[PDB]
Structures are given as C-alpha cells and as structure tokens.
C-alpha cells in the first residue's frame, strides 16, 4: 500500500496520484 | 516535497496538495 511505497521507501508523484480519486 | 519518505500527517498533506479537488483516499493498513 501507500505506506510501503511512500513512507518506508521513497515516495514519487507517480505513486501518489494512484491514490487520488 | 514529494520525493522523500512521507509518513503520517506528512504523507496526508502531500496527497492533499497533489490530488487537489479530486480528493484522495488514505489507507494505512492496506
């Protein structure tokens, strides 16, 4: 999930947008 | 801003700024 991709590892705009509605 | 470790409120604010009016969903325990 988002925590694994952005908190435990370095986040990215590509990944963040996967969580926008 | 976006290219770093973002946790808790820091991650939530990044989603808020990036998604804008589209909104977003935050799920810690996925």
UniProtKB/Swiss-Prot annotation, chain A:
Superkingdom, taxonomy of origin: Eukaryota
Disulphide-bonded residues: 6-11
Q: What is this protein called?
A: Insulin A chain
Which portion of the complete protein is shown here? 88 to 108 of 108
């Amino acid at each position: 999930g988002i925590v694994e991709q952005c908190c435990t590892s370095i986040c990215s705009l590509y990944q963040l947008e996967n969580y926008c509605n | 801003f976006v290219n770093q470790h973002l946790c808790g409120s820091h991650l939530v604010e990044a989603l808020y700024l990036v998604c804008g009016e589209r909104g977003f969903f935050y799920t810690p325990k996925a």
